[model samples]
Target chain A: MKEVTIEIKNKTGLHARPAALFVQTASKFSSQIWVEKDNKKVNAKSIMGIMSLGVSQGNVVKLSAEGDDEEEAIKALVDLIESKFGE
Target chain B: MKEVTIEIKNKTGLHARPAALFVQTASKFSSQIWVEKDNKKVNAKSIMGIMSLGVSQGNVVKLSAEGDDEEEAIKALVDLIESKFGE
Candidate 1:
């Protein structure tokens, strides 16, 4: 298992296309991934759950995963967020 | 503008993969689309907004669209929902 705390830097936060891309990236991995904010955790592979977080710019969030590729999953998700979802 | 009231017959309602597919379908049209439930409305193209509604199985939702392809957009969305998102 692995966990990483990160902040959203994009202007639009994780909405619209970014949320879709987040879910898409999470879906490609075998790890069971989740995003945590305000003590609430949601399935990273679930667009609905991700959206429910209402994560916005400057909002810190925790990304956690458990599986064989847990590290990779966490890194990839962090990379995606750092890239601001390719805004 | 066109409006249609429909029920989410899918076992999962609008969550996870179905929510992703719903946003995908709504994005293909030029029309502005919104989904409403319990008097709360959200952009149909927004996965975050859609998921925030917490729409569940058997929930009745209102779909509204405005623009060149409003009619077609409404029809396609309705069809996708009625098809249970190909569950």
Candidate 2:
């Protein structure tokens, strides 16, 4: 199991492009991935669930993974958010 | 023809759901609509152009319409943004 809390740095938050990118990235790993905020979590690979978070700028969210690629999943997600969704 | 410059009050900007709503609303009208930011104008009915602009919170953008329903078109678009993408 692996997990990390990340501050969403993108000006637009986790919507649209960023959310799309995140879901795409998470699907690549063969692991169970979820994004958690305020104790509420959703599957990372589900676009609807991810969007429902309505995460905006300055929101700190947690990314968690449990599977064979847990570490890789956590690392990649961390980097993605830290990079502000590559904006 | 009708036009109005509106400040994006939505925290998510003109991306994802808001862009979807904008495009959906614009497509319903027979008028031609365009969104302008920093002199770069794009078809308001195109999701690609809308997201590409990356207009974030507090960014002022212009919405224009020209056709039989120009007034109605412009008004709807302005209201959508002013309401913070209905958030």
Candidate 3:
């Protein structure tokens, strides 16, 4: 299991496309991933769940993952968010 | 290359979640996908492009695909839109 905390640098935050992309990447992993923000947490693999968080730019999101590839999942999601979801 | 026109059946249209799912599904294909509305077209894999559309319910969207899996891409997108992105 592993986790990483990072800030959303994208202009639109994780509100739309980035949210979709984030979930998309997480869904590709065998690890169980979750996103935590402002004391709220939700499954990172679910598009509906991520959208409900309404995470915005500058908001720090904590990504945690368990099972195989936990570390990789954490790093990838963090790198993706830090990269602004390739904005 | 292939193209299909389908009406927005979802209540929220392709404004947000539906848009995300549409693009996410489209991105899975090796084929090049483009979404057309009101005579305007944009890359289906681009989240920014989809949002700019401001798609609403009742609007008809045309999906075009080229390269490998073009037919599958068009059919998948049309089916997704027709299914209201599983709303």
Candidate 4:
């Protein structure tokens, strides 16, 4: 398993579009990906799970992946958030 | 004013949730921020405008901000997308 942490920078937080993007990204990886926020775990590949978290800007979330390609999955995803979804 | 380009790493692209988050983040800065894709310009702070672009994985999008805090806004947002929205 591999893990990474990212801080939400979008002021409106993680809403529908962002969540969908995240889920889509997570689905690409073979690993089981999950996001952690305030002790709650949400499936990273599920739009509903991500939307339910209601993440906002400045929020720190942790991502964990377990599978054959966990390391690559974590790195790729962490880098994606850093891009701010192309603003 | 400044501009930055980011590649879409999420499979689903800039769907509803990610677009909303991007708009919300853009709303924080005083600058006028817009995202450009294939010659189309969309307001960075408007959800509808972003979704209309239909960004997809591996797509490169450009962001431009003009205003008092344009530089900072651009930097912050660019970094956010790189983070993959906390996936």
In candidate 1, what are the lDDT values of residues B1-87, reduced to their tens digit?
A: 111122222222222555666788999988888877778889989876775766766566677888888888777877777667675
True contacts kept of each: 0.00, 0.08, 0.01, 0.08
Higher TM-score: candidate 3 or 4?
A: 3
lDDT tens readout by residue for model 2, A1-87: 111121222334213776666777888988888877677789888765666776766666667788888888777766676666755
State TM-scores per candidate. Answer: 0.46, 0.49, 0.47, 0.44
User: Distance from true position, residue B18, model 4, in Å?
Assistant: 12
Q: Over the stretch B15-87, how does candidate 4's per-residue lDDT look in tens digits?
A: 3566645666888988888877778888888665665676654566677888988877877777767776555
Q: Score the docking of each candidate (DockQ).
A: 0.04, 0.08, 0.04, 0.06
Model 2 interface CAPRI class: incorrect
Error of 4 at A68 (Å): 0.4
Q: What lDDT score is found at residue A73 in candidate 3?
A: 76
- Better model by TM-score: candidate 1 vs candidate 2: 2
Residue by residue across A1-87, what tens digits does model 4's lDDT show? 111122434433333556645666888988888877777788888665665566655566667888988888777677777776556
Clashing pairs in 2: none
Q: Write the per-residue lDDT of candidate 3 for residues A15-84, one digit (tens) a residue.
A: 3556556777889998887776667778988765676665655555566788778877777776666566
- Score residue B75 of candidate 3 by CA lDDT: 72
The top-ranked prediction according to DockQ is 2
Candidate 1 lDDT, A1-87, residue by residue in tens = 111122222222222555656788889988888777778888989877875776655666767888888877777777777666554
What ranges in model 3 sit over 4 Å off?
Answer: A1-15, B1-87
